[PDB]
Write a protein that binds this ligand. Sequence first.
Ligand SMILES: Nc1ncnc2c1ncn2[C@@H]1O[C@H](COP(=O)(O)OP(=O)(O)OP(O)(O)=S)[C@@H](O)[C@H]1O
Ligand SMILES: Nc1ncnc2c1ncn2[C@@H]1O[C@H](COP(=O)(O)OP(=O)(O)OP(O)(O)=S)[C@@H](O)[C@H]1O
Ligand SMILES: Nc1ncnc2c1ncn2[C@@H]1O[C@H](COP(=O)(O)OP(=O)(O)OP(O)(O)=S)[C@@H](O)[C@H]1O
Ligand SMILES: Nc1ncnc2c1ncn2[C@@H]1O[C@H](COP(=O)(O)OP(=O)(O)O)[C@@H](O)[C@H]1O
Ligand SMILES: [Mg+2]
Ligand SMILES: [Mg+2]
Ligand SMILES: [Mg+2]
Lengths: 174, 325, 546, 329, 348
Amino acid sequence: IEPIQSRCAVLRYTKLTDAQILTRLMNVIEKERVPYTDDGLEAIIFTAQGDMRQALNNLQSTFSGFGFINSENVFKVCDEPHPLLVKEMIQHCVNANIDEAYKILAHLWHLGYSPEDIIGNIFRVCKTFQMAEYLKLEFIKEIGYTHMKIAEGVNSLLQMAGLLARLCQKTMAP
Amino acid sequence: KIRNLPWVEKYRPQTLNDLISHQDILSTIQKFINEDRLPHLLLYGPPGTGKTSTILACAKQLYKDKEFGSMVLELNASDDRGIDIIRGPILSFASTRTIFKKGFKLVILDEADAMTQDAQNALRRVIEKFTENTRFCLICNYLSKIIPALQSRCTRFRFGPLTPELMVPRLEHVVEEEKVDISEDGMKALVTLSSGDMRRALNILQSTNMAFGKVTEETVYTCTGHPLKSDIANILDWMLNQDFTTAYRNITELKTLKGLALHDILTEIHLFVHRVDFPSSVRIHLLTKMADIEYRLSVGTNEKIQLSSLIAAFQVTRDLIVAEA
Amino acid sequence: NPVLRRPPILEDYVHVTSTEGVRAYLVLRASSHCLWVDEFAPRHYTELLSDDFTNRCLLKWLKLWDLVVFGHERPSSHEQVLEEMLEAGLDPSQRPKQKVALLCGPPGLGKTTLAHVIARHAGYSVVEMNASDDRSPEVFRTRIEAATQMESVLGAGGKPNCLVIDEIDGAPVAAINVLLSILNRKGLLMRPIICICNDQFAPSLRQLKQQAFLLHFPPTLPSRLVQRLQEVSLRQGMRADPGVLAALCEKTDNDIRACINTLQFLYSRGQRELSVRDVQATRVGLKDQRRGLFSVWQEVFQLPRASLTSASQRFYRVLHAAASAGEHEKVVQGLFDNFLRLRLRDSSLGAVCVALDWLAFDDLLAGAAHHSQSFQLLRYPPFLPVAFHVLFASSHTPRITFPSSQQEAQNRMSQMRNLIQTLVSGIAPATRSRATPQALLLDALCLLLDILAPKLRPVSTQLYSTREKQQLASLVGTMLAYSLTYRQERTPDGQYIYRLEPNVEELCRFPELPARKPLTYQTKQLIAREIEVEKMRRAEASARVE
Amino acid sequence: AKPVPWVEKYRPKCVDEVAFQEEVVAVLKKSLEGADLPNLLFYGPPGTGKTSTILAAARELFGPELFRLRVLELNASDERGIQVVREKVKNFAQLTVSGSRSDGKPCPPFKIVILDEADSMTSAAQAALRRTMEKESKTTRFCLICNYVSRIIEPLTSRCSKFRFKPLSDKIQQQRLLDIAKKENVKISDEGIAYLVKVSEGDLRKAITFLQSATRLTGGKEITEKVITDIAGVIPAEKIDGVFAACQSGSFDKLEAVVKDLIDEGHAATQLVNQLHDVVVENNLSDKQKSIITEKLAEVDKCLADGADEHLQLISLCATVMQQLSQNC
Amino acid sequence: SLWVDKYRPCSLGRLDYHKEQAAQLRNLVQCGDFPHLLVYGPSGAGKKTRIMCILRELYGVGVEKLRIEHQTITTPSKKKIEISTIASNYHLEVNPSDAGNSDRVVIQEMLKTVAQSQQLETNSQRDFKVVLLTEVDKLTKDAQHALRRTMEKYMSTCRLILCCNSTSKVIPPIRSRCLAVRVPAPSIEDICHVLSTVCKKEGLNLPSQLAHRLAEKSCRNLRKALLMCEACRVQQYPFTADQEIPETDWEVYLRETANAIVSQQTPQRLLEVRGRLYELLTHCIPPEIIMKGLLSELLHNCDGQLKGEVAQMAAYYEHRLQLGSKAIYHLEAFVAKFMALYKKFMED
DNA sequence: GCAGACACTACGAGTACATA
Ligand SMILES: Nc1ncnc2c1ncn2[C@@H]1O[C@H](COP(=O)(O)OP(=O)(O)OP(O)(O)=S)[C@@H](O)[C@H]1O
Ligand SMILES: Nc1ncnc2c1ncn2[C@@H]1O[C@H](COP(=O)(O)OP(=O)(O)OP(O)(O)=S)[C@@H](O)[C@H]1O
Ligand SMILES: Nc1ncnc2c1ncn2[C@@H]1O[C@H](COP(=O)(O)OP(=O)(O)OP(O)(O)=S)[C@@H](O)[C@H]1O
Ligand SMILES: Nc1ncnc2c1ncn2[C@@H]1O[C@H](COP(=O)(O)OP(=O)(O)O)[C@@H](O)[C@H]1O
Ligand SMILES: [Mg+2]
Ligand SMILES: [Mg+2]
Ligand SMILES: [Mg+2]
């Protein structure tokens, strides 16, 4: 509440820069004697996404499972972050390109992601995406209309493809 | 001895070697167990991929049968898991020692997506403060229902869908131990209709073995009720080649003779549309139309009218496709 | 081209045929011991930082209490109402007509500081009530009765007890009821009570505002605030030019406590000169502010006056502040009640149509969240005020009123449903089953009221015709079947009228309809008299039959 | 010796009396022989036999003396919250299987939990059922009955072996109705039974109800086709031809007049949608006109499924097909 | 007593219209094994008269001796709700739509207590009881889904006669379980015959032209027609051919609201129309009847190439109204869309 | 030995809210 925040110096922490994670990664690596490559540590930083707990967890998992930090050893047990692909698929939906958007949607579907998580990351990407304001508003309305159908019980690849096609229709309908 | 159990519970991977698909994740988990450094796990993925069985094999490997009640506190959605439980029994289990033998404890929280946000917020410092004495495993299907603090505290392993290449030998083992006659197309139909889920594959195998006694593509597609690929191709050929009354008569005759449902027809037609080299506008219109029909079938609607609309969605775009040239 | 006239040679193909029968092919594949807010805290009256009026008003309110407490005759727009009410006189109990003073405003101005300074200045002894007490109604009652209803234990020369109740808005409804019960004892209240709150529009402080000395706190002026921050920085021996102090004042919302705490964190002892980029950074001193409803509606309906001209920044600002305000239903009601009163430039009503689409989308989302128990659908109705801001962005000065049409419509609908339930229950069960209340309301009320009110001459029953007697008896029977009667009613103008006991004319008549001739006083009195004598005759007939 | 209506009098008492659901009947028959009965999920159109199959099966497996101690039947007519699933279903599933049949017939070593009408169960209450079936399946079995499988969550769908109850074919429904008519001392013509199996559309409960009601209406004489037509609410063809004549006229006044005629004569809009669609898919209209008329028919049938007003949906559908018929004029 | 209740028929053989249906209902309930009934049709057709005639045929003459019964039911939220109930010595009538969204609690608790209890006297009263569920089209889907097993388990002991206006609002699980009985509205000649018989039984004379105008103005509603016939008797005893028939206030208020819609298409006129719709909604008029009256009057002032789009617009916004919860949003959206379409039509 | 007084926990009741 506001009276508690007025009683303090409200300090605000930002998400960690990759070099700031990288320095403590050097620290943990030299006290733990972890063999590594540079690209594997960029993969660890990419999987962490500003989270130092996730960086240490993924580094320990890659060191315990394989004993060496390259890119494909990291990506064998960790995963690429989900909304970085959702940003490119929303960008493909912006230029009314249904084929690449469905390619990314089917890739995320075959990875085992539930429709709720996919539509939530779609809404978070469309929240901060760079387009027109009215186009963003009708996109958010379409996302909520599809999320109603997801919530009532019907959740298949056909509903998500229909959402993608309606988002492509919103661009071509001024 | 013989037991009266379903085949999805009679044949359970009690050890980590009996699971098939996620070999790198299970190798890392076995190296965590063997080096006595198992962290807080977050096992998430689609259903039927083996997340409960993995942690049950881990708990069976870590602790013997004479001390299993003193080490594993397993709580799922069937039990009440409120903030009273997190501040009560879970905290007292986490903050105390073991009765019989010295070792680290394990708190398994199955269906952690169904927990409230108050319990998940109260779970953070129980995980962080007592990480030397006990480890917490959260198993969920939806990662969006878990707060980001719990996702940060627990290292996540995505138990993705089971690919049909490594899913075959487990079904072969179940077939060999169950004395089941199965052809190659029957196993192909099992691993196709299962779609990355070993639970419904065993359910389909048991239901087809009880219904027919044999597992063939005809028997599997009859017991499940799914349409075959040739009939979906024929339905697409009728919708793209002939006029409204003849295609309607052909599809209605096929649906009456085979006893098909429109949901599986819509799913397979949606899969066949993206393979067929359609124009972008035609594909967008078709996807919107089949989304409307599949939404419409979720209520007390007439299926014949929706089938006529399914034919209509292709009869609209036939002229557009032909005049596109 | 995705469509091939010639068939593919190697790839699989799917045929497509039009209605004209031609073919096409596709592909299937102690300086250091204290806070700076406490070290620089005011101890005298002359070092207060509030608005001067509010200080004069509180001091003059406390200085008139001397006649009853100290036993001395001599002590030594919102402006006009407060100046009139101070000199309004006294009731016959030598005590003020306002028995408590309510201090309202945003946090961080000095309401508690002004209350304590004024109480210690007027010879009183401060008794502090806070939210850290139990605040149960019995505990509240005994603590007010202990603070206000006895004198000091020291006897002569003991300072009288001034009850200061901080955070009265967090008190329950029964605590305010206990306070108003001890306020209106006619055991009289002999000591002043000061109440301090952060929001006057709380539902628990509705009655208090009709009885208190309502003191509204404006935000502090930037000049006095910057000068006081300069005194604070100079007493600590460090330099900050007044541009960065004005930036801190604009960032912390005229807050003395937040600015002094932010200066205490940013100064420390490593450096002496404050940089502008440190204050302009968001990493320290920024707090989320609970915006008011009217500020949210003003920021939605009015564009900011002229960087900050980008539309995406206005989108994010409107969305974040409308989410940070809270009470989303009241914001939706205000947007519904205020978007048709603007000078709309969309004469084709497309913006109004899509705004109503957005409102129906919000309503559908609320129903789907409250029906399927899926509350993750509530992330989108925060985008309704930013949709209204995008649609109706204007540079004018709109007069935003409070929403009340939906609430008065719901109250009126509940009142007419209660009236319908009253009408149905009086009807005998033989004829209640023959028609639903919906069909009786839609079909059998206005025509029923046309049956009950015919053309009747002001003539006594002895001079009436036999047809008139049959009509009168039939109408009295229809009145008695539906359990209706006329009664006496009083009017402030001084005349008597007759009206139905179930007043079903409001269920029937509509305001914009043309008028119809009602029955007269003679006719209505005569009908009510036959209703009573028909009830008596029916009782006599029931006694004769049984 | 009280009378009993024919839908309950001819309710299957055993598994062999269930019609046309051959795969699931064979599955329960092998479970009757002693095979491993899995967790069942029954879904399909109404009147197909989802409740009666599992009730006759449980009567076959348990008999009369063990139905109360081994079968817990829960429907939407009683309370099924999160607490009923957490307490009552879990305490029943944690019970012991004790008590054998006294007639010498074999007794299965499990209990049966019948959660009929499981669409009405919440998503939270369905999530509490998952490890109840995963843990206590040694001593109990679960059978969820629903109409729409989309209302069942994907863990519960994956846990239960799904059997889809197909709509009944014309032949099997014809023999079942003829056997019921033979057992009841009543007679019906070939055209009458053909119109009965055309009207019922795979609903055996509706067919038995119409046959019983025609028997009571006629009193015991010949059940002809006309009593079937006036007992089913089937709109006569003259009204449909009048509707199409008003649509081909191109004026909204005659369209309103015939829509008000059809509304005031009590004809349901579902029957009008069905008969209108049957006329449109079997005439000489163009493919585009048939396409958007059938799309409007689908959206009007959907709008009637959420309980919208009859008159406005009928006037919208009639306006759309009026515009389609008068576009080519 | 009014004319709608004084001259209601008692037995099935006294009905002046739908006599063949009366004989069919006489033959239907004679044996006693008749299934659940779904009496549906337009309002004012005579559905409740036929249901009470069926109840008179089954039991004695004791089905006309009714009483008001009150029952308090406990919600899952532990809030007590009182529901009224017409009950007799043989049958009982429930209106669960008076409980609002808590009709599912009424079905789950009130109906099971009636259905699970066998009748106290088995010789005077018959082997089964009848429960009258009136206005099941206004029932929520949860209450209808809670209804179905009660109509299957205790059917041979507790019979049901469901009454509604539209069977589209009834779920097909309920619609499969009950035999649908269609009661159409009487035509102009049947309403004229009923009005002439009522006027002759009262000693009056009714012309054919006035009875015809009363029949057309009631829109085939016999209750409404008898009410305006009684009102026309009250206002003027000489029944002239051109005697003015009184009208209900909400219908002419809806007509003036639609006239105000047609007269101006501006945002402040939209605000005034929203105030008129608030006045209509606060008088407990259902919103679908407001939409029907709006389409009935606004189509008189539309041109011939505009009526179809207005009809489709009204149906679409009525469906969105039935999907939503707040009526004023969808009503004002329909009005605003009509003003936009009317302005685009007139300006071009 | 039995009546009165003390604090103790279990239970009933009212209210708020559920998103990024
Ligand atoms: N990887 C696997 N290898 C072998 N059998 C498997 C595998 N995954 C699932 N199964 C079979 O499917 C059954 C159910 O597996 P579970 O571990 O319960 O699935 P799950 O991961 O828990 O999915 P949810 O989200 O809990 S429904 C097991 O008892 C096995 O018979
Ligand atoms: N003139 C002043 N110079 C410096 N500090 C001051 C001055 N006046 C007040 N303060 C400090 O600023 C704060 C004033 O706020 P308070 O009176 O304690 O609470 P409030 O202003 O009523 O706001 P809330 O709602 O209680 S958080 C205290 O910490 C005082 O020490
Ligand atoms: N396959 C069938 N074989 C024999 N009689 C059947 C069959 N299906 C339905 N019936 C008859 O119709 C009645 C109703 O069948 P039910 O099993 O209740 O239908 P249902 O599957 O439960 O439909 P829903 O989904 O509950 S509305 C039974 O009592 C039988 O008299
Ligand atoms: N056969 C008939 N003969 C005379 N009057 C009738 C007849 N049928 C109905 N009525 C009158 O018409 C009105 C119709 O109302 P009701 O019977 O409740 O049907 P609904 O429930 O459809 O309104 C009743 O008030 C009744 O008095
Ligand atoms: Mg599991
Ligand atoms: Mg204060
Ligand atoms: Mg059933």
